[PDB]
Symmetry: C3
Subunit: 156 residues, 3 copies
């Protein structure tokens, strides 16, 4: 039963704000959202089996003029895949991606997606979480905002 | 010992539109383009073996001012990795990515690439295709625009 | 003991010029950086065992007005994953990504990341390397700029 997970964002709990925050609302059993041998605790994917896993995340940001105004036109759309654990409580970034975007002008719709992927050694007990800026601009669709992991091979 | 695929764009045709369409011309036996156990049917990567596959797509877009007196003020460069089948035949997006761009500047060259990847459960018979907007802006090189998949493990 | 590598950028040595270059300084022995059954030489990841490998790279560019000014208003922020050989002086592009960005004044901070991935057939003696434009704008953090590979299955 090789470990893996593909979590999709749960808009039914999308926090407001523009500052860097951790996302804790994800789906694990519906649509493309699956999970196995791994446990999820409010946007905190816990590893139960040691191994080399490939981790990835796809976060889509969007804004339509019809939704109203945004604090500032110069945005910083960032995504951070973080690892946390009992021994190491502090957060450490495994991957970082994103871009500054000027969403000014009279344009009606603005969109931008970010993707990151990497190969990492994970020990049971360690947890991966997703931190992003401007969580209010996140796209709610499961094909738009998601993150996952899957074991590729055992640790030597 | 496991199926896989890496298809590269075949600009043999002349897709000159702006609306989102379904790319149907791909290579499977040239350069890096390859395939094993999987079958290609006019832009349709058909799965001939159940199991979990990692899907990925890289789409490059570019534009030159000389191709002028044509709107490239507001652009929506998007990519969609859709899945179809016999049952569950209605098109369902597995992954979405892209960005809005303003390529009306005095710059002689504009470029932007999109990348998406994810871990998915697939059953034999199901198909995977690629849909993008502004297909006439696609970069033809085999290293710029491509998509693919490879089985990571069997379904439990 | 499947072959793999996750290499992180070594800030120390990084071209301060404005030309596109091959990055030749990466870590393989600290932080998330790691390598197994592959050899890092002169910034090139040499394949020591024939097989199909998944290859990836994540490149982050950034700029703070305190660091001075950009070389030009409309920058080309690109990455090329290249394959060369220890036997013949051949050089081929496997993947390409990036985009043109206007980082002219205004904002106090500019950021942009690119990500590429792909399934490739590699043989012993072949080497994977990274070329980027605007190397002086590279983000030196290990979670920011890195590239890697891992064998998924043997050839044939
Ligand atoms: Cl799925
Ligand atoms: Cl290849
Ligand atoms: Cl690691």
């Amino acid at each position: 039963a090789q470990p893996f997970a593909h979590l999709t964002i749960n808009a039914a709990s999308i926090p407001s704000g523009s500052h860097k925050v951790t996302l804790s609302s994800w789906y694990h059993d519906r649509g493309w959202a699956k999970i196995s041998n791994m446990t999820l605790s409010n946007g905190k994917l816990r590893v139960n089996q040691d191994g080399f896993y490939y981790l990835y995340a796809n976060i889509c940001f969007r804004h339509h003029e019809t939704s109203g105004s945004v604090p500032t036109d110069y945005l910083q759309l960032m995504v951070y895949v973080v690892k946390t654990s009992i021994k190491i409580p502090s957060s450490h970034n495994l991957m970082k991606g994103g871009s500054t975007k000027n969403w000014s002008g009279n344009s009606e719709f603005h969109f931008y997606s970010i993707n990151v992927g990497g190969f990492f050694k994970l020990r049971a007990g360690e947890e991966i979480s997703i931190q992003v800026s401007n969580p209010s601009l996140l796209d709610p669709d499961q094909d738009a905002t998601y993150f996952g992991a899957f074991k590729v091979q055992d640790i030597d």
